[PDB]
Design a protein around this ligand. Sequence first.
Ligand code: CLA
Ligand code: CLA
Ligand code: CLA
Ligand code: CLA
Ligand code: CLA
Ligand code: CLA
Ligand SMILES: CC1=CCCC(C)(C)[C@H]1/C=C/C(C)=C/C=C/C(C)=C/C=C/C=C(C)/C=C/C=C(C)/C=C/C1=C(C)CCCC1(C)C
Ligand SMILES: CC1=C(C/C=C(\C)CCC[C@H](C)CCC[C@H](C)CCCC(C)C)C(=O)c2ccccc2C1=O
Ligand code: SF4
Ligand code: SF4
Ligand code: SF4
Lengths: 69, 73, 80, 74, 139, 742, 151, 74
Amino acid sequence: VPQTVAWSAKTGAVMVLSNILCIVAGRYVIQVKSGSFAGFGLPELLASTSLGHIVGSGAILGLSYVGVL
Amino acid sequence: MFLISWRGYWQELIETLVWAHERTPLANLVRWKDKPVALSIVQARLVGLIHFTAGYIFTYAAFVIASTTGKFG
Amino acid sequence: SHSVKVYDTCIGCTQCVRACPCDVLEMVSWDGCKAGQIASAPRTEDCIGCKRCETACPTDFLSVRVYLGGETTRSMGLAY
Amino acid sequence: GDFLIHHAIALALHTTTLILVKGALDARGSKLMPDKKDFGYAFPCDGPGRGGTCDISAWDAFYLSMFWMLNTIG
Amino acid sequence: ETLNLQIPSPTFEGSTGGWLRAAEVEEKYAITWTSPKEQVFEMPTGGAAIMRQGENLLYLARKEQCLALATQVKNSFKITDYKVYRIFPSGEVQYLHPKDGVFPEKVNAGRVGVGNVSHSIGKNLNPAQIKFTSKSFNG
Amino acid sequence: KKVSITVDRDPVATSFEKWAQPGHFSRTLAKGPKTTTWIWNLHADVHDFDSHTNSLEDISRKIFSAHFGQLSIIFLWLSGMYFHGARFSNYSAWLSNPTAVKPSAQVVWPIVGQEVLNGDVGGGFQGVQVTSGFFQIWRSSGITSEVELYWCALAGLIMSGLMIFAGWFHYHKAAPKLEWFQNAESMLNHHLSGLLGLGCLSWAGHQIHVSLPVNKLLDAGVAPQEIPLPHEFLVNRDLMAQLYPSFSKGLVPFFTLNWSEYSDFLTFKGGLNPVTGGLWLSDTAHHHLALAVLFIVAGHMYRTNWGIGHSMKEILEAHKGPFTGEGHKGLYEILTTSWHAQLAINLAMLGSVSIIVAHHMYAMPPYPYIATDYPTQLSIFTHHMWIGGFCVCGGAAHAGIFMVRDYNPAQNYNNLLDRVIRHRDAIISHLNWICIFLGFHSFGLYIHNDTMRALGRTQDMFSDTAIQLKPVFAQWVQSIHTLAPGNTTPNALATASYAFGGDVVAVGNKVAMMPISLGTADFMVHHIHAFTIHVTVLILLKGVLFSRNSRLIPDKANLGFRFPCDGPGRGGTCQSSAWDSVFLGLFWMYNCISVVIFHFSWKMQSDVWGTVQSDGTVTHITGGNFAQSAITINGWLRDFLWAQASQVIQSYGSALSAYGLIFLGAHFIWAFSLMFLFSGRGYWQELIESIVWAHNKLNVAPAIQPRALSITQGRAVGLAHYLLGGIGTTWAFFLARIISVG
Amino acid sequence: SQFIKPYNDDPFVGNLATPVSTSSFTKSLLSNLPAYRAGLSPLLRGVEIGLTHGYFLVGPFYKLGPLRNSDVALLSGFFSALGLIVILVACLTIYGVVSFEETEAKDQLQTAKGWRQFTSGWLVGSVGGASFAYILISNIPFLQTAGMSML
Amino acid sequence: QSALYTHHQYIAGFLMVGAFAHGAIFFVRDYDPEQNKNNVLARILDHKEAIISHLSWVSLFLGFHTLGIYVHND
Ligand code: CLA
Ligand code: CLA
Ligand code: CLA
Ligand code: CLA
Ligand code: CLA
Ligand code: CLA
Ligand SMILES: CC1=CCCC(C)(C)[C@H]1/C=C/C(C)=C/C=C/C(C)=C/C=C/C=C(C)/C=C/C=C(C)/C=C/C1=C(C)CCCC1(C)C
Ligand SMILES: CC1=C(C/C=C(\C)CCC[C@H](C)CCC[C@H](C)CCCC(C)C)C(=O)c2ccccc2C1=O
Ligand code: SF4
Ligand code: SF4
Ligand code: SF4
């Protein structure tokens, strides 16, 4: 079984990082919608944090698997 | 096959085979003298009837001879 | 070729000619029916024998009558 | 068992005769094709008109009764 | 009257359903028509082509292939300007349809009736009567 | 907000007036019958909605309400299976002793001596043995009571009432407009996220909270009435944490992403449960939870009302390369304006999924005690092969209907359809060649082996003892799947299926699953499969590609999808329609699926199923005769059909005598079909003329003039009786054989 | 960029110019092959095709034939190949007789004289190629085995 | 004994079917109604529907009952 850990500030760091990474990515790549103050709506934010949680969870589970944590 | 499947299906198969033979290199050097057509409606009824009948005769002749020979009684 | 005949019970409805996919039939003047016209077959060499003309015939017994005969490349519907 | 099979053979001889007799008597014509004689003994059909005329020739009743002959001799 | 061989053809990306060696060795059929538009039609031999505005020329292997396009062009695009020709490998061009300038469904003077039988179909002779004699079954 | 709900209110009046006027839906049939053909033409075109109406809106409304009617019928059917399990079954007796009691949920009335069909299935019970696998489903659900089966029957009854109400409501009270139905992005988002995703999520939740505790208690050995009721696991988290100690921490490990705490009940074990011979339900719970996450994530792909998402039109129009012209341009317009194009795709996929279901369910038995219930394993494999094959041929049927009717060349210039129709001779000629090559090189190997074995030349055969056609690629893939646990699936503990290699899993001394070795006989029968699938594809594809026109008939689209012929000319154009290729390909589907189920039945009896003796020897049902006898046709005739038809023929006077009766009845129906298949309409119309004369003579002629069936209907009736007769023969033979011996 | 075009710049001909049908590699191979090679006599065309076909016919008859396990397997395989050559050369002869009307010109296969020259070359080449295969397999032990001589 | 009986019964069924086939060929090709006015042959054709419908009846009669008794027994 892959080794996962209880929540720590490092897990929080990975989630926060992945979320911000996806906010910036969503500002660049979402085709239908002041770098972040132009056309930034709730759907765009909600979609990017949805992916940020998907990417963050995948990253946390993988970095816990390999030992990086 | 001759009694259930009928001509239009087979003529459309044969026209794709005619296309393929004419378009295949090293094979289009050889040409038919008679245009390949599907069997006729009456001809295929006869061919299926002959195959049905021959299968009927050969199956029963094999059974009536082998069952009696093998059993002897 | 096939042999296509038109009998004098033809009412000149022009439907068999319209049905013809191969321009076998045409209309000629005839005083026998009320329409003043009867079907004719001057091109039975192009007749494929589809018998669509027979289906379109509204007479009790088809005035247009296809009799399948000798086969040719044209009457066999061969594009090869 | 002999009684039942003899009646089965009676059905088979009568049914093969029905198909063959229907072919012979309707060989020269029928309501579906009155001028059947003009087309011969073995022709495919008269086309899809008048509802459909597959196996309308007298040869085709030979064809259909050949199965019933095989079934009865079976 | 004669087929102008230089008529441009419809834009077809080609197909495998077109004509084979019998077209260049036995007979080929051609159909021409005038279109008011640059419009897509369906080929009898396959997919879709675009007929050009102005005059179009087609090469088909069958007269029914030509008349199938003729009906598609008359019922969907209302072209009544179609002429169907049979082109021999010799280079002879035979005009076919409409044969005398008027459609077969319309009466025309100078048409002689071929195949017309003076009696009804039930007055045909029985085959036994016409057996072993050259006399025809249509009376 | 361009995705919106729009409905016409009170479109159609709920009146019995059109019920009283049969044929109301079409202009041809509404003027009443004059011949008996009208009667047949009534049923033949009833569900052909796009033949009655021009508007896509009324067509879509009729389809939506007919889907609710179908769902109502399925829910009524399910409610009946639950009620027959509750009331007329030995389910409670089967729960106590799953390996000895035979499932039975059907009891016959004593009328004409037919009460012999209430055989001794076990558990102090008499009834018809049932093979649908419902008992194994219910044990997997954790039902453990007939009261809960009554509550499931009522839940099915309530759903059946709600679906028949919803069909009435959505046709007669609030029918959606066409712009509602043409929301493929919204529908896909909801059917991936909502239907499949919350379906898996809710089912995984049920498995974790109900199936897992109840089935752990059942496999521990606790009697069904000693097991706590399924809500007592929901409340008493302490009692649930006894069985799975991870429940002591609750949902904190889920949200904090500490998911390895849940490894007690979300496993990746693989293999089978040794006690039941079924899949580990902890694996099934993890499986459904993982599918739920991806299905919900997938249902966020498409753009609906907020700018995020894909336009499927943009995805399709961007995929074009140098070989394929304009590419997938125009396919979105097709699939949102043609129902038949959607039904062609979805029927081919539903049939493919049903075929996948049959292979995966036998190989990886998913229910407790289903693997060693061999009548159920054979029944559900054979059933889902037939549902798969039928649905695949209906995918080609509605591909033909799309091509004849909904295809417009103007909107399909130089796209993928245009290019396929423009090289259909190359496609059909290459498919024709591969089918000839593969009939020669699969069935001709059988003819070679028949000939050599008949000639005394056993050294000249294709066999394991002679020339060995080994399936090296299939054996190699089996090697990889046996080596996969710990190597390429490192966290797996066992193989995905024991069919690939590994242990023999035995439950109640009967083999649950065991390695299926592949030899020369398996090479030969798999190439038989590849051949029969290829030929069925050739007939169905030749019908789709040549549905609109040929070199033979250049105007085939004007004759329609379903026409009998275009006359005896051009040599004869009998069966030239796309319908007649569906008709001819349903025979070859029958041929294909019959060989697949024969291969499965013989191979599983010969090499998988049987009893485990002391020292782990497995005495198989037919004693390993597949390897040396499935290489000849005489072996299939002798060692499979003749040897195993013993049970149907000798079933009279027992509980399996119904199978002997259906065996004979289906031989009758199959033969009776050949009257419609080998004959033509003109014979029967002239015979009917003589019968009409006999009626006229007695002044008893009907006013609805009797006609022989149409040419197409004679073909359809022949095919329907042929399929019923063949499949019913195989159904009776399979079921009496495996109920007696397995 | 489109890699498929109408064949011979004629849209209504029943062919499509495709990479497989009309690449330079395909055109080079067909022209290089003896049947379509320019400058090649019909007899020489038959000799090259025959040498090829007779050479590879021996191997299936030898390796998979009824007498394969016998020491006379190669002789049986050669004789079976030779018998097949004689049947095929009869087929070539009868096709030539019916298909082509007698004409003076012999420079093409599609002529009565040219197909007779082709059949003559094919027989000589096929018997020679079959013989060459027999000589090579007899001399080389590795060819006598199926490649398992190293094993 | 089995081969001889089976052989000659199959020859019998072929000859009997062929007899009716050539009666159909006779009607199509060699039968002249004017030369055969009100004969046994013309009057057989005159009631062709009585003959065929009564063969249909007896075939159906026997088939329904013989099969029904057999199915009853099964
Ligand atoms: C949907 C699946 C399904 C299936 C296949 C069956 C099948 C069966 N059930 Mg089960 N059943 C079901 C659902 C199902 N049931 C449901 C949902 C319930 C709960 C209400 C029950 C409750 C139930 C009980 C309580 C019993 C059965 C019994 C039976 C058996 C005989 C029934 C019988 O002869 O009725 C025949 C009854 C008639 C009235 C004859 C029908 C004749 C009419 C004309 C039908 C025509 C329909 C009509 C024409 C349609 C048009 C409507 C009209 C407006 C035109 C049979 C095995 C019996 C059994 O197993 O005994 C051991 C039994 O006692 N069933
Ligand atoms: C997330 C929402 C959602 C869900 C669950 C469904 C579900 C379904 N739709 Mg879809 N649909 C949706 C949104 C949704 N749709 C939207 C937004 C549109 C507009 C674009 C459509 C347009 C549409 C069409 C046009 C069609 C469907 C069809 C279907 C049915 C497919 C057959 C099947 O597998 O049913 C069996 C599976 C089931 C689960 C049956 C349950 C039935 C209910 C309705 C499911 C949901 C119940 C409820 C939400 C659950 C509450 C849980 C509670 C106990 C806690 C299925 C009931 C087809 C059909 O059969 O029509 C009836 C059809 O033709 N739908
Ligand atoms: C989701 C599945 C689905 C759907 C919605 C449709 C819907 C449709 N199909 Mg498609 N089709 C399907 C599956 C489907 N079919 C499959 C699986 C096949 C392969 C067999 C076909 C093959 C097919 C063809 C070949 C044709 C259609 C046609 C039609 C249309 C009208 C049919 C009609 O009125 O029949 C009304 C219903 C009947 C007449 C029922 C009779 C069918 C059998 C004989 C009854 C079965 C009885 C029972 C199962 C077994 C007998 C038991 C016995 C012991 C009592 C309609 C658009 C036809 C059409 O009009 O095209 C537009 C058409 O030509 N389809
Ligand atoms: C057992 C009966 C039988 C047999 C042998 C065949 C044979 C064939 N069918 Mg038919 N078919 C049958 C029943 C049968 N069918 C029935 C009942 C139906 C009902 C609907 C159909 C409907 C049907 C359709 C609709 C299609 C076929 C197709 C095919 C061909 C498949 C290609 C192939 O395998 O070539 C290999 C040939 C064989 C397997 C025949 C057996 C030959 C064996 C191997 C030995 C050869 C003997 C050898 C020549 C001896 C020579 C010496 C001798 C001449 C003296 C092939 C010609 C397809 C086709 O033609 O396209 C490819 C096709 O599309 N069939
Ligand atoms: C009650 C009505 C009725 C009557 C009086 C007849 C009368 C006759 N039929 Mg029958 N016939 C009928 C209905 C009827 N037919 C129907 C509905 C069919 C279609 C299945 C047929 C099919 C049929 C065939 C195929 C044959 C006859 C033959 C005959 C003749 C011989 C008598 C015989 O053996 O019957 C035999 C009867 C049957 C084989 C079928 C019986 C059909 C059912 C039982 C009757 C229908 C009941 C009807 C619905 C009553 C509704 C009225 C109600 C509303 C008040 C005789 C002229 C035979 C003939 O020509 O021989 C001289 C023959 O070969 N008929
Ligand atoms: C088992 C196979 C089989 C069977 C039963 C039949 C049956 C029949 N054939 Mg056919 N035939 C077959 C194979 C078969 N044929 C084949 C392979 C061929 C070769 C093409 C032919 C060619 C052929 C021709 C050319 C002729 C016949 C004729 C007949 C009839 C002869 C017996 C008779 O007159 O009354 C016997 C009647 C029966 C056996 C019918 C059974 C009664 C049914 C089953 C009642 C059951 C009702 C039940 C409730 C239905 C449930 C349906 C469910 C959906 C609700 C009968 C309809 C002749 C005919 O029509 O003469 C009048 C005729 O002209 N047949
Ligand atoms: C279709 C067709 C069209 C027109 C031309 C056509 C070719 C002519 C025609 C074909 C017609 C065909 C094919 C006709 C076929 C006709 C057949 C097969 C007629 C069979 C006749 C057998 C009889 C009368 C047996 C009589 C036995 C008796 C009396 C025994 C008596 C007894 C004795 C002596 C000893 C035992 C005691 C008893 C029982 C008392
Ligand atoms: C027997 C037969 C007929 C005659 C069959 C008819 C007229 C069907 C009439 C049967 C009775 C009248 C009704 C059938 C009822 C059955 C007892 C069960 C039917 C079940 C569904 C119809 C509901 C044809 O018309 C035909 C046409 C083309 C090819 C082959 C054939 C063919 O074989
Ligand atoms: S259809 Fe019959 S009637 Fe009308 S014109 Fe042609 S022939 Fe004369
Ligand atoms: S048969 Fe077809 S082609 Fe010949 S005439 Fe009648 S319609 Fe025209
Ligand atoms: S289907 Fe019946 S009618 Fe149409 S052609 Fe073939 S035989 Fe003649």
